[PDB]
Amino acid sequence: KKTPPLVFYWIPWFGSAASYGQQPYEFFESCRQKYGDVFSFMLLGKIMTVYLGPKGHEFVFNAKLSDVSAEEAYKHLTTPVFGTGVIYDCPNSRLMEQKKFAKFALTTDSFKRYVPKIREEILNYFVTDESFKLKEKTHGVANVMKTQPEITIFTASRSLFGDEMRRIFDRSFAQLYSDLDKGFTPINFVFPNLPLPHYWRRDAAQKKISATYMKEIKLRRERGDIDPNRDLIDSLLIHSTYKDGVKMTDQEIANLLIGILMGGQHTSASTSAWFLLHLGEKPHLQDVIYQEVVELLKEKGGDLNDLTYEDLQKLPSVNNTIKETLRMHMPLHSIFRKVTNPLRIPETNYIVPKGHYVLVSPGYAHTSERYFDNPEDFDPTRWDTAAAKANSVSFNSSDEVDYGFGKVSKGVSSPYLPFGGGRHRCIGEQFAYVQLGTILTTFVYNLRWTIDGYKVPDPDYSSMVVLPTEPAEIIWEKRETCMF
Ligand SMILES: CC[C@@H]([C@H](C)O)n1ncn(-c2ccc(N3CCN(c4ccc(OC[C@@H]5CO[C@@](Cn6cncn6)(c6ccc(F)cc6F)C5)cc4)CC3)cc2)c1=O
Numbered sequence: 001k002k003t004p005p006l007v008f009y010w011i012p013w014f015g016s017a018a019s020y021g022q023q024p025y026e027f028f029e030s031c032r033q034k035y036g037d038v039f040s041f042m043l044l045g046k047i048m049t050v051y052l053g054p055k056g057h058e059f060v061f062n063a064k065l066s067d068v069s070a071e072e073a074y075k076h077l078t079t080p081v082f083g084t085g086v087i088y089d090c091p092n093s094r095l096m097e098q099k100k101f102a103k104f105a106l107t108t109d110s111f112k113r114y115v116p117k118i119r120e121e122i123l124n125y126f127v128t129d130e131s132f133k134l135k136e137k138t139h140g141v142a143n144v145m146k147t148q149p150e151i152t153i154f155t156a157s158r159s160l161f162g163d164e165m166r167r168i169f170d171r172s173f174a175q176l177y178s179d180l181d182k183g184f185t186p187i188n189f190v191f192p193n194l195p196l197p198h199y200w201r202r203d204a205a206q207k208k209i210s211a212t213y214m215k216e217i218k219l220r221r222e223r224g225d226i227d228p229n230r231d232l233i234d235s236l237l238i239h240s241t242y243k244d245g246v247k248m249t250d251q252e253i254a255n256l257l258i259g260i261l262m263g264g265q266h267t268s269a270s271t272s273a274w275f276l277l278h279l280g281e282k283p284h285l286q287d288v289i290y291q292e293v294v295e296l297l298k299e300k301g302g303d304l305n306d307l308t309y310e311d312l313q314k315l316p317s318v319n320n321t322i323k324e325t326l327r328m329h330m331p332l333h334s335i336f337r338k339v340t341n342p343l344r345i346p347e348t349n350y351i352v353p354k355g356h357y358v359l360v361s362p363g364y365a366h367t368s369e370r371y372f373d374n375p376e377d378f379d380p381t382r383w384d385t386a387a388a389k390a391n392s393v394s395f396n397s398s399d400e401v402d403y404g405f406g407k408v409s410k411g412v413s414s415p416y417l418p419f420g421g422g423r424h425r426c427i428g429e430q431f432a433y434v435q436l437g438t439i440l441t442t443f444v445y446n447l448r449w450t451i452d453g454y455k456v457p458d459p460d461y462s463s464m465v466v467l468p469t470e471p472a473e474i475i476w477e478k479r480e481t482c483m484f
């Protein structure tokens with residue numbers, strides 16, 4: 001009566017890892033139907049306490065700074081991958097402000113600039129890459145698991161870092177990111193640093209990529225032109241001063257960029273991968289977006305005026321599509337807080353011993369039939385003339401709160417929380433809809449793809465983000481054959 005019911009573990013230290021590791025939303029539901037909303041289950045030595053539904057969103061995201069802590073849970077996943085000093089390798093208050101700094105490059109004025117850039121890179125890929133080669137080919141097959149992470153990393157790189165850094169990638173140093181990218185695996189949670197080639201190439205890579213950003217930060221500064229609020233590198237050059245007057249070192253700034261680049265790239269890659277495969281099973285939907293985009297362009301020329309950020313606003317169908325994939329495949333299937341003081345689940349007789357791991361999964365409610373009718377059908381129409389990414393789209397108090405990076409909703413009690421809530425809330429929400437929006441609109445305008453006498457592959461949950469199975473590929477044709 002004082003603790004949540006810990007459950008059976010197939011092999012004990014191993015715990016429920018396979019059932020949960022194989023499918024969390026299924027595993028969660030099986031327990032719910034005979035224990036209720038909260039229950040514990042052990043995993044890799046660490047036992048896991050879960051709270052399902054909106055109320056579990058409140059108890060976790062809105063937990064006091066003293067009761068839980070995300071630094072503890074994420075430290076080894078990120079630090080060895082990004083670097084020291086920043087993001088979970090520092091007090092919470094340092095993290096909060098590092099958000100404030102970064103947000104200055106994620107504003108409406110930046111976004112208007114980012115869209116043409118982001119589109120321009122996509123068009124580079126359509127031509128130069130073997131997957132498409134639109135200039136010479138009219139048919140094609142694209143492995144979305146290859147293309148999307150490359151398109152996402154090139155688009156993010158160009159928007160947030162600039163054109164000098166995007167030209168540096170055209171080289172072998174591209175490799176260094178593949179090596180650091182491999183370092184970013186849930187295998188870190190338990191194995192942070194081992195002596196085999198993987199971990200060495202990963203530490204080496206980090207230090208060389210950190211140097212690359214340090215040198216560009218250096219020159220961009222001394223050269224003396226950091227004036228346009230061009231990007232994320234500019235905004236950290238001018239804002240990197242904490243409350244107390246302490247100032248981030250340039251290596252620390254460099255590690256933050258790496259953190260944010262890889263952080264944003266993985267999540268956004270999944271979602272673009274997923275709405276390509278899903279849009280491919282239902283090509284009817286692609287033509288909905290295509291008609292809407294052409295009607296917006298108006299009378300002649302494929303586009304009367306190349307599509308802008310403001311225009312991206314006027315396209316509910318594009319935005320509704322992004323909301324549906326984030327519902328059906330929230331890249332982050334489970335979010336953790338390590339418990340630092342015993343917690344008294346209210347409207348309950350439970351204490352969560354200190355030292356347990358607290359797991360919240362908005363994705364469950366997203367996939368849940370208890371909260372969405374026909375939850376496993378890809379139907380973006382369910383968003384009824386409501387294309388907003390977020391608002392207090394659910395109940396309880398939704399008044400505002402400031403944790404040090406801008407005022408944010410107090411109430412997190414919604415079934416749909418793809419970007420989370422509370423202090424660790426995502427700051428990249430609007431950058432994603434822009435980036436993904438531009439990828440989507442650029443894709444349908446030039447290509448019409450399909451899905452090979454089949455339907456969407458089963459998701460793999462064994463990595464950072466929820467990704468598709470190995471033979472994941474779309475077969476494209478051209479909506480207009482002659483353009484160069
Ligand atoms: C079946 C055999 C079995 C045995 C074991 O072999 N087995 N096999 C396989 N598995 C297996 C494999 C994996 C798991 N994982 C459980 C834990 N999951 C996970 C996912 C995401 C996480 O997020 C980390 C942070 C959160 O915020 C981010 C992200 N972000 C938000 N916006 C942008 N980025 C962030 C923030 C800000 C930044 F600036 C940067 C950032 F990055 C980073 C944390 C944890 C992964 C799956 C479980 C089981 C097994 O159990």
Ligand code: HEM
Pocket residue numbers: 070095099260263264265267268271326330331332335336418419420421423424425426427428429431432
């Ligand atoms: C669809 C794409 C994205 C999704 C679904 C997403 C989702 C989330 C979620 C759920 C969290 C909360 C994690 C937690 O509570 O522990 C989060 C945090 C965060 N995200 Fe994102 N994110 C996305 C893209 C981005 C991008 C593009 C950036 C940067 C440009 C970004 C930066 C962050 C940061 C800095 C945090 C805060 C980490 C913390 O407070 O501990 N995310 N994101």
